[PDB]
Amino acid sequence: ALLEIIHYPSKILRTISKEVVSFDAKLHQQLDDMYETMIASEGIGLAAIQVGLPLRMLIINLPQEDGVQHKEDCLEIINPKFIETGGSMMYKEGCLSVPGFYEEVERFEKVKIEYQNRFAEVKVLEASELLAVAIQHEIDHLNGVLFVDKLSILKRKKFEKEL
Ligand SMILES: O=C(/C=C/c1ccc(O)c(O)c1)OCCc1ccccc1
Ligand SMILES: [Co+2]
Numbered sequence: 001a002l003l004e005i006i007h008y009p010s011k012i013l014r015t016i017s018k019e020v021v022s023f024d025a026k027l028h029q030q031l032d033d034m035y036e037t038m039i040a041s042e043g044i045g046l047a048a049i050q051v052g053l054p055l056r057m058l059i060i061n062l063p064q065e066d067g068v069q070h071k072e073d074c075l076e077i078i079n080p081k082f083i084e085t086g087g088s089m090m091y092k093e094g095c096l097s098v099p100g101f102y103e104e105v106e107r108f109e110k111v112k113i114e115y116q117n118r119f120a121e122v123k124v125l126e127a128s129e130l131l132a133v134a135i136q137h138e139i140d141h142l143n144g145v146l147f148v149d150k151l152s153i154l155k156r157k158k159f160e161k162e163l
Contacts, residue, residue: 003037003051008098014144017047017054020078023120027057031076031118034059039069043096045134047141050097056080058138062130075125077115080139083124084112091133093147101162105150107136 006012020027030053038046038059047058061074087109094102112126113135127135137147148159 001033001036002040003033005037005041005050005096006052008146008148010097012052013049013097013141013146015049015054016144017049017056017142019056020116023078023116023118028118030055031057031059035061035071035074038096041096044069045138046096047138049141049144056142058141060131060134060138062134076118077113077135077138078117078120080113080115080135080142082111082139083114084110084126086110091130093133093137095137095147097141098146098148101148101159103148103151103155103159105133105137105147107133111135113139 030048034046034048034051037051044062045058045060048055057076057078059074059076061069063069064073085108088106089109090104091107092102092104109132110126110128111132112124114122114124116122140147148156151159
């Protein structure tokens with residue numbers, strides 16, 4: 001099913017999401033609906049709070065070389081924690097919850113996270129470049145943080161101007 005995506009400035013997006021403890025059919029249904037919703041809106045990442053579900057889970061599916069998203073490439077990241085962070089880089093970001101707006105954010109250039117997949121299997125994943133940015137952006141959502149919160153002095157006013 002398609003889910004409604006919640007947009008700025010909804011206070012729902014300020015919610016701190018809760019750890020998932022039951023990795024069951026309902027969880028899988030929600031993840032499937034998140035995927036359907038993300039793809040229908042042409043997104044590459046989605047956190048559960050963006051569809052109103054305050055759970056610490058997010059999906060990321062980056063396009064391959066022909067610009068196509070293959071389902072087998074989708075990461076389902078549940079209960080993530082950072083193990084390591086490194087470096088710094090600027091990256092131009094957007095967000096399904098802030099549609100039509102894009103701006104550079106400073107992110108770690110490399111991250112290592114630990115998380116669980118939909119079968120509760122523990123994973124460790126190292127990421128750089130776009131994947132690292134997507135991981136940081138989506139984890140920020142779980143903590144009630146939007147990328148526009150991270151903009152500089154100069155950039156928020158451009159954001160408010162475009163508003
Ligand atoms: O999927 C997205 C957002 C997509 C989107 C779709 C329609 C829009 O009208 C829009 O304005 C944005 O963002 C995911 C997070 C992200 C952002 C930047 C880099 C890495 C990861
Ligand atoms: Co987002």
